[PDB]
Amino acid sequence: ACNFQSCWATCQAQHSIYFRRAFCDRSQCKCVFVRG
């Protein structure tokens, strides 16, 4: 199971201003973020 809102919150909470977006990739929470 994967949840968009839950994933977004998780990804946003950990990732700082480098956080792009968050979503469900396949069936797993995927966090998008840049390095530099």
UniProtKB/Swiss-Prot annotation:
A GO cellular component entry from the record: extracellular region
Pfam families (alphabetical): Toxin_37
The UniProt record lists the keyword Secreted: yes
Residue ranges the record marks as coiled coil: none
UniProt cross-references to SUPFAM superfamilies, sorted A to Z: Scorpion toxin-like
Disulfide-linked positions: 2-24, 7-29, 11-31
First-listed, main subcellular location of the protein, grouped into a coarse class: secreted
Keywords: Amidation, Antibiotic, Antimicrobial, Disulfide bond, Fungicide, Secreted
Glycine amide PTM sites in chain numbering: 36
Organ and tissue specificity: Expressed in salivary glands and hemocytes.
Taxon lineage: Eukaryota, Metazoa, Ecdysozoa, Arthropoda, Hexapoda
Name of protein: Termicin
Induction, per UniProt: By bacterial infection.
